[PDB]
Every structure is written in C-alpha cells, then in structure tokens.
C-alpha cells in the first residue's frame, strides 16, 4: 500500500483494488484486519518520510482510500458478514494506537481535529449506523490528553481539510466546458497555493482539469484582434495554463499527456509538452527531428531580440522554434563574440513580462547543450542570468501576477536542470523557498551498488515497515542495474 | 526552625570558603530521608533554605552552567508562580544534555579546567545536581515530582525525537537511581495502578495478543506503540542501573499490590516480564528474595488458575517456568509450590507435572 501510494497517486482507478482482491485470496487475512493493516498504513504516512508537496499527495491518497475501501465493501465480501461490524472492531481496534494519533498531532498541529473530520468523512461515506458514538467515546479519550506551546501558533484554518472540503467545488469549478470567459475564475488561482492541484491528485477532475486546459490552449489561438487589454489578458491566461500544464507533467507527467493524447483527430504542440523534462534525455534529438523550421517566421525571433524595446502582438510559434534564438544567444556569447555585454540585454528584453514559455524553452536547450564538454558554460550562465530577479517591473508588465508566474518558473526550474546543476558546479541558490524536492538519487558516488543489503534489507526487515521513502531509492537501484543480479 | 535564620548568615559570610569540593548530593540526600513526611510546614522555612543551598552552589566560577541557569532567572522573582509546570519542558532540557552525553555537542563549552579534580570521569554526574532541591520548597514532591519525571514517556514531548527513546529512557534511569525513595517508589504505584489494569479484563481487544504488545523494540515503527508497553520498558529502564539494592523493594511491592489486580493471564505475562528478566541480581547477592519472587510467580499463577474459563498460552508460562526453575530456583523451593501445585486444574497438573523433581 505505502508503494503504490508512493509511485501512483492518481490513475488508480482499481489497479490497487484488484491487487488487494488477489492477495487476500492469495494468503489468509481476516476482513477486520485486513482493514487495520490498511488504515494503519495510511495513518504511517504523511509523517515519517514527506515535509512538502508530497504532504498532500499523501492525504489525497488516504482521502482516495476511501472509495476504494467502499468499492471494496461492495464487491469484496458477499453473503458474510458483509461490513456488519468489521469497521466497528477495527477503529476500536485502531483507537488503542493512542500515541500513534498523538504523534500525527504532533506533526500535523491540526490532526487530531483532522482525524475526526475524516472519520466523519467515513462515516459520511461508509458505514455510518451508530458508529458515530464510538467517535465520540474515541475523542472522549483523545481530547482530554491535549486539553512552551505549539498551539498559539498554529489557530488558523488546518490545509488538509480545507482542501478536502473545497475538493467538492474544485470538482464542480466552473462546469464550462468552454472558452472566453473571464481570468478571474482562473485569477483566483494565482493567489492560492497548489491545492487546486492537490485536490485534484484524487484523480476526480485531473483528466478532466488537463482536458479543459488542453482544450483552452488549443482554442486561444488568439484570433485577429487589436484590444490590447484584452490581448494581454488572453496571453497571461495562456501563460498560466502552460504553467499549471508543466506543473503537473513535474507531478506526475505521463497521465496528463495521456488524457490529453488518447483520442480525437487533432494535433496540438504536444512536442514541446513531451519533450520538455522527463527520465530521458533526447538532447540532440531536438536539433535533430523537431528542427523543422522553414523561412517563415525564421527570423521572427531574431528581429524580436533586436528590437524587443515583445508583447506587441499575440502570437505564439518561437516556443517550437527557438532554436534560432539560442543559436544566435550561443554565437555572440562566446562562440563568435558578436556582443559581449548585449547578450545580457537581449535575454533580458526576452525575459518580459507575460512570457514565461521561453524560459522554459531555454532551461530545454541548455538542457540539450549540456551534452558538450562543458568547456564553454554559456548555457549555464544564461540560464543563471533568466531565473534571475531582472525583471523588476522594467516593461509595462500589466501581469499583476508575477509573484506566482515567478515561483512557477522557480519550481519548474527547479525539478529540470537536475543533470546540469549536478554535472556542473552547484548553482548560487536562485530559490529563497522554504523546501525543495528532498527525493533525488542519493547514491554515494565513490561506494559501490553492492550496499542495498546491509543498508535496506537488514533495517527493513528490523523495522516494521517497508520504509517508503528508500523505496525512491529502490526504484531507481530497479531501472538502474539488472533485475537478473 | 530559626535555626534557618542562622544558617542563613554563616555562608553569608563564609560561602567563598567553599571553593575546594562541590558534591552536595551525597551531602544532601541524608537530609530527607524520612523527613519529607513532616517537613512539608518546615518546607516553607526550606523555601528560604533552598536560596540559601544553591547560594552553596554559587561558590563556583568555572564557566559550567548555561542552562540552569534559566531556571536561577526564572527562580528569582515570585517564585511561587512560574516553575511549577514548565519545568517538565525543562527537565527534558535537562536529559536533552543527558542524551547530548554521548555524540552531540555538549563536548565544548560545558567541561573545563581541567578534567582533573571538577568530579569529571562523566558529565553524567552534573545531572543529579539540582533534581531534588528544584521543587522541594512546596508540596510538589509526594507524587507530583514522579509524575513530572515519568510524562516524558507517556506523553509525545515536542522534542523527544522516535529513535532514540532508549537513551532516553536509560538516562531518566540514571536520574531516578539518585531520588529519595518516595520519588521513585510513587512510580511504580502508578504503573500497577491503572495501567495495568484499564480494562483487561472483561475483553480488553483483539489487540490482546501479549508477546507482541509487552516486546519492545516495536517503537521502530510508527505504530504498535500502546503507551502501557511504554510504561513497562520504563520500568526496566530504571532496573537498567538501579540494580543492586534496589530489588528488595519489589518482593513486599508484588506480595500484596500484585495479588488483588489480576484475573487473566496476559496480565500475568505482564508482571512477569516486569519481574522476570533480574533473577540473576537476586541469585548473586539477594538470595533470600528469589524464593519470595517465585512464591510470588506461583500465587499469580493459583490466582490466574482459579479465575479463567480456560488457558489459551499454556505452553508458554509451562517452558517459562521450566527455564526459571532450572536455571534459577535449583532445588530449592520444591516443596513450598508443591502445597499449590496440587489444587491446580488437571490439564495444568499434566501440563507441570514433572515439577514435583
């Protein structure tokens, strides 16, 4: 359980239902505690391993759980003892594992309140006869422990129940499968955090949520108009759909492609959309195949470098073509020395406002360059230059939402560049975050791959659980060397 | 009492004379022996005394003290305000430099001048300093002072870390091993009061499986932690060091607090692995106790006998109590369990049969 929850948050339907099914057929598990194994091991999470995003990637699985669990009380049991009292034994059970809830309180400042507003989620969900007084005789124990402090700090709205609360209105958002409207409802947006997103990890609205985005981006072909508020209304509106799109391919990638690219006769720039950052390099593949760039508009971006003064009109095709710019970024830096100090200039007029798709497409290149001898670093230099704090209200930026169009780049940034940051010196801290991605490959270098017994095995088989976090580790251990050995 | 009033001047005058040796624990500990049970009036007189002990204390210029000194600051105005409850943080504070003895980096600042004659071979003895004398003014010890060292265990601390709760443990051991008796003897009242009796006995849970529960070493996980196993290992933490005279509390302890508290038998697994695992210290120096602790074994198990539908463990208290007779008891006993072993139920009397040799 804590390894699918850990690999495939979402697009589980019933893949994990069906595992469940065979290995209680394939072992002998009584129903009561099968259900405590379950439970217990969504409690484990979200407390030992995860101090981030994955936080709530882990409640969203434990809140999903629980469609699963009524799945399973529908087609699992027949005919006996069908959900009788199973789930009453099993909080009775499970409430004798005080400090258990005593330390998720602890973690979480707001679980102990969480945990009943879940129960009552359950009990909303599932089974709900009378079950509610053995809550109430649960809290009845737990309240009393809890009544120089932690408590004065922590007295606002808990973030885990107020996203599975609003995940029910998230679901329901707009109902508009369609174009036009105002940013607003997307506006609201900038100002939260990603729980949008994490309410949509339930796998509820992340299809759908991908596919009305897919649907705007290939819709807001911007047309022919002139209103030049509405234009950069429109381009800001595209921007954070890119933006929300990449965030999720660095969440989870593959499903949102594959909902948006399983049918329909269409085909929209699903090239730069796939070929951005994954486990997989295709550095010179770039130069090779998806440089298909004929005259038209070849020269488009260059003449856009030299006289930016960049927002003039709507129009979106350097992002597939690039290619031309950091051809012409490279060969004055320091291959040709056509500007010295120009570059700087030109990528910073580049770097205006409402164009956050070139970073992207320039962290790519750089990407694809590092494939050198790293004897020229110009790439890792401009980069260093693009995520930098230029723009600073230089142009009539009329975004009104750098701040997270900002901390988007920062974290898109952040989750590619990996190989370049790490083959390279490490970067001069651009971030002033509060906690990156704590999953990498933390493989000690000068050790060799004959370490996973006596680092993994033995604590494992010590411990009492399958300690999901070194299953990350695991993972790549798995596609790293040879299943035979 | 004016006495007080007396003492009070004489250091006034000659405390820097004191600048030759610092060990008031051994110079102390004798002072309340058994006058705590009618010192508690004549303890606020000591509210003045203490002032005047530390004031002993005060005598001392090395640089050795950066945290106790929060509680001097906090002890200097309306003392009968402030150091009542946040002390247990505080005493966490305090084992927090117990379990900094060993890897962390209490190693600096803290020892100098110059490991030679300052009583150092282990910081460890600078913990005992003040423990007693840091509440004993008002009514606070009798019970309030165990229950303030035993809630780092039963209770999650902010601090307390979920991997290293055995040094912890070990090191509130190594406090306890220098409290009066009444300190550490309200302790095990406690233990046997409640926790080993909550409920379990009309039908506790599912969870009712012992060996599982009573084992330690389960904390490795974030679960099958149940606070009363906690308590138990509690328990052996102070019997981790407070194992040479201290035993011979425990046979009177168990003769009558023990009988009338169990009716099922994982109660039994219970005091006994709370029992069990000293024989030796009594073999070796306290040899007339183990005869009262097997005695003891025996009357839990004519109590588990006479109140039980039937016995769901039997082969384990069965090689139990053969390891314990053949590796501790000798020949010794054999007759005294006989007038019990008798009157026990048929099966148990197959069961323990070759016990009568």
Known sequence: ?485 | LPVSKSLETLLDHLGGLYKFHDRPVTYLYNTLHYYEMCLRNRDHLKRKLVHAIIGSLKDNRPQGWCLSDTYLKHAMNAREDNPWVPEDSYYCKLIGRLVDTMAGKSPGPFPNCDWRFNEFPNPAAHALHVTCVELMALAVPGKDVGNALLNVVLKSQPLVPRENITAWMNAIGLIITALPEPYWIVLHDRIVNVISSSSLTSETEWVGYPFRLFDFTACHQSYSEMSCSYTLALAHAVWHHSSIGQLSLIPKFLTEALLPVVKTEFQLLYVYHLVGPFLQRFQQERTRCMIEIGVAFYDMLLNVDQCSTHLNYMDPICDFLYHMKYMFTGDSVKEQVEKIICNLKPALKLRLRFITH
Not at chain 1, 32 to 45: D, M, N, S
Not at chain 1, 117 to 138: D, I, W
Not at chain 1, 227 to 255: N, P, W
Not at chain 1, 464 to 471: A, L, N, P, T
């Open chain 1, 1 to 485: 359980i804590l390894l699918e929850g850990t690999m495939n948050l979402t697009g589980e339907m019933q893949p994990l239902v069906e595992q469940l099914m065979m290995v209680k057929r394939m072992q002998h598990i009584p129903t009561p505690l099968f259900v405590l194994e379950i439970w217990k091991a969504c409690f484990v999470g979200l407390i030992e391993s995860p101090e981030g995003t994955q936080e709530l990637k882990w409640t969203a699985f434990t809140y999903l759980k629980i469609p699963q669990v009524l799945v399973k009380l529908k087609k699992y049991f027949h005919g006996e003892k069908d959900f009788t009292e199973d789930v009453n034994c099993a909080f009775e059970f499970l409430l004798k594992l005080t400090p258990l809830l005593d330390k998720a309180d602890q973690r979480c400042n707001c679980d102990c309140t969480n945990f009943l507003l879940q129960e009552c989620n359950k009990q909303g969900l599932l089974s709900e006869v009378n079950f509610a007084s053995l809550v109430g005789k649960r809290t009845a124990d737990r309240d009393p422990q809890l009544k120089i402090q932690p408590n004065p700090g922590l007295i606002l709205r808990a973030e885990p129940t107020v996203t599975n609360i609003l995940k029910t209105m998230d679901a329901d958002h707009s109902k508009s499968p369609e174009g036009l409207l105002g940013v607003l409802g997307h506006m609201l947006s900038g100002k939260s955090l990603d729980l949008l997103l994490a309410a949509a990890a339930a796998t509820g609205k992340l299809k759908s949520f991908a596919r009305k985005f897919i649907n705007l981006n290939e819709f807001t072909t911007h047309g022919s108009g002139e209103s030049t508020k509405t234009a950069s209304v429109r381009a800001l509106l595209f921007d954070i759909s890119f933006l929300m799109l990449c965030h999720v391919a660095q969440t989870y990638g593959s499903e949102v492609i594959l909902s948006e690219s399983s049918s329909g006769e269409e085909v929209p720039f699903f090239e730069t959309w796939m070929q951005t950052c994954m486990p997989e390099e295709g550095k010179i593949l770039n130069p090779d195949h998806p440089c298909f760039r004929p005259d038209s508009t070849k020269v488009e971006s260059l003449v856009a470098l030299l006289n930016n003064s960049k927002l003039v009109q709507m129009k979106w095709h350097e992002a597939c073509l690039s290619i031309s710019a950091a051809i012409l970024e490279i060969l004055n830096a320091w291959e040709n020395g056509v500007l010295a100090f120009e570059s700087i200039q030109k990528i910073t007029d580049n770097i205006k406002g409402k164009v956050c798709s070139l970073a992207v497409c320039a962290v790519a290149w750089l990407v694809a360059h590092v494939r050198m001898l790293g004897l020229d670093e110009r790439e890792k230099s401009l980069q260093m230059i693009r995520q930098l704090a230029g723009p600073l209200y230089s142009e009539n930026t009329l975004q009104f939402y750098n701040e997270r169009v900002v901390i988007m780049n920062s974290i898109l940034e952040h989750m590619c560049a990996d190989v370049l940051q790490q083959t390279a010196t490490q970067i001069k801290f651009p971030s002033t975050g509060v906690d990156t991605m704590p999953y990498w490959n933390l493989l000690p270098p000068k050790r060799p791959i004959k370490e996973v017994l006596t680092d993994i095995f033995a604590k494992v088989l010590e411990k009492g659980w399958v300690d999901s976090r070194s299953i990350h580790i695991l993972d790549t251990l798995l596609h790293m060397g040879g299943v035979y050995w």
